[PDB]
Amino acid sequence: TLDGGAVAAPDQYGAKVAAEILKKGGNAVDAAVATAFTLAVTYPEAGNIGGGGFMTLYVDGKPYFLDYREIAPKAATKTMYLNEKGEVIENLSLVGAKAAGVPGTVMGLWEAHQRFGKLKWSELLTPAIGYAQTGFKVADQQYQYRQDAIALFNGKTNFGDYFGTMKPGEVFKQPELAKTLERIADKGPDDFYKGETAKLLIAQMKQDGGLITSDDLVDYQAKWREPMRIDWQGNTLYTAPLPSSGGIALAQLIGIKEQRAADFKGVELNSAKYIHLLSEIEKRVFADRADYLGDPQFSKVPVAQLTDPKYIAKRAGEVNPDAISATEKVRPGLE
């Protein structure tokens, strides 16, 4: 029991909605679900129902991790973005329907709520529906991202047909998204993966030559996983395991820094030596990241070996506190 609840959200709307839920007696998961749908309206550059993500939780004294990352469509192939000369095709993995993985967000928010929520699902979507219908004020940075995206898409999508009228400090309404959110509130993820929204997504794919099919959407599942646990200085950090690279990275960053504590003593934050030391550690982290890490159901990722304390000490011993390590001599540590 604390002096209250709290929210730190990337805009004022997610913050307000999260606080309204906590005040209405929702718990942190109830608030999180409402906030996630709200930002799918007010923060469409990143907040979404057509994307994916990860949720780390601490509920009644125990840690949890929910993986609702997108999956490659069943028709995806290793070489799908190479041209007839074996070259990567510029922006084919970035712009247009073939760049999309199967979205996971609606399933992820559902599973979190089903397991831990206290309030009714439909009630958690009403705030987002409200912002889709009566609108939200577009932000300066948001508008700038809109301008850059238009430039990158290069008139190759329907982006402008929906987000071309975003204007900063002016109200932006999204009637079709309002109706989609209402179907999700009434039907659950069934709408998105098996119902009207699924059908509209598949028709978009067929029009644009994308790969996502009905079978892809019906097969999508979010995955609960054991969170990455990192202990240091008496604190316990829970963070994302594979398919996030960040949990292994933080285990190595923190562990190596602790091994090199003597080199950090008396060193001021963001001094040249501080930044050099962090860079030396990041060299080894990114060497391992590129060589070993990926979806753990698709190869035998040596997670235990890459976070073993004796391995951490060996990699820390490579750190050069006085000069830059030769980049061509930095190897993945199990080579």
Partner 1 sequence: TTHFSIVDKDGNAVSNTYTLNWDFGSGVVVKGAGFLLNDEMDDFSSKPGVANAFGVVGSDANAIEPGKRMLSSMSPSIVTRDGHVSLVLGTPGGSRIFTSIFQVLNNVYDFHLPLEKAVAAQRVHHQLLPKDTIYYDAYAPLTGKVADELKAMGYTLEDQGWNMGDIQAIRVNGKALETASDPRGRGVGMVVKP
Site for partner 1 in 109-138 (CB under 8 A): 112, 132
For 239, the 3-state DSSP assignment is strand
- Residue list 223-252, contact with partner 1 (CB under 8 A): 233-240, 243-247, 249-250
Choose between 209 and 310: whose C-beta lies nearer to partner 1: 209
Q: Can residue 152 be called a binding residue for partner 1 (CB under 8 A)? A: yes
The two three-digit tokens of residue 302, written as one number: 């040596």
Footprint on residues 21-40 left by partner 1 (CB under 8 A): 22-23, 26-29, 31-32, 35-36, 39-40
- CA-wise closest residue to 136 among 233, 60, 41, 56: 41
**Which is closer to partner 1, CB of 60 or CB of 84?**
60
Q: d(Cα 26, Cα 273) in Å, to the nearest integer?
A: 47
Residues 39-58 that bind partner 1 (CB under 8 A): 39-40, 43-58
Task: Find the part of the chain contacting partner 1 (CB under 8 A) among 120-128, 143-151, 310-318.
Answer: 143-151
Q: Cα–Cα distance between 220 and 255 in angstroms, integer? A: 36
Q: Which of 111, 125, 127, 146 binds partner 1 (CB under 8 A)?
A: 146
Question: Chain centroid to CA 299: how far?
Answer: 22
Beta carbon nearer to partner 1, 299 or 305: 299
Angle between helices 175-187 and 28-42 (to 10 degrees): 150
Minimum CB separation of residue 158 from partner 1 in Å reads 5
Q: Which residues, 6 or more positions from 187, have their beta carbon under 8 angstroms from its beta carbon?
A: 195
Q: Which of residues 1-20 bind partner 1 (CB under 8 A)?
A: 1-12, 14-16, 18-19
Task: Give whichever of 84 and 161 is closer to partner 1, judged by the CB atom.
Answer: 161
Cα angle 48-136-119, degrees, rounded to a multiple of 5:
60
- Residue closer to partner 1 by CB (options 2, 310) is 2
For the CB of residue 208, give the shortest distance to partner 1 in the complex, in Å: 6
Instruction: List all residues 6 or more positions away from 244 whose beta carbon is below 8 Å from its beta carbon.
Output: 54
User: Of 126, 149, 224, 260, which lies in the binding site for partner 1, with binding defined by CB under 8 A?
Assistant: 149
Q: Which of these, 317, 299, 210, 186, lies nearest to 263 by C-alpha position?
A: 317
From 200, 25, 49, select the one nearest 128 (Cα to Cα): 49
- Nearer Cβ to partner 1, position 294 or 317? 294
- Kindly state the tokens that stand for 145: 């991202």
* Closer CB to partner 1, 220 or 311, in the complex: 220
Residues 154-183 that bind partner 1 (CB under 8 A): 156-159, 161-163, 174-180
Among 122, 126, 143, 145, binds partner 1 (CB under 8 A): 145
Q: Rounded distance, CA 248 to CA 296, Å?
A: 13
The candidate with the shortest Cα–Cα distance to 127, out of 207, 33, 202, 48, is 33
Contacts for 127 with CB less than 8 Å, ≥ 6 apart: 17, 20, 34, 37, 38
The interface with partner 1 within residues 57-116 (CB under 8 A) comprises 57-61, 63, 67-78, 80-82, 86, 88, 93-101, 103, 105, 108, 112
- What is the C-alpha to C-alpha distance for residues 124 and 188, in angstroms, rounded to an integer? 12
Number of residues near partner 1 (by CB under 8 A)? 159
Cα separation, 86 vs 120, in Å, equals: 52
Residues 270-309 that bind partner 1 (CB under 8 A): 270-272, 275-276, 278-279, 282-283, 286-287, 289-295, 297-299, 301
Among the listed residues 264, 303, 314, 318, the single contact to partner 1 using CB under 8 A: 264
Considering the complex, state which of residue 203 and residue 313 has its C-beta at the smaller distance from partner 1: 203
Would you give the DSSP letter of residue 168?
B
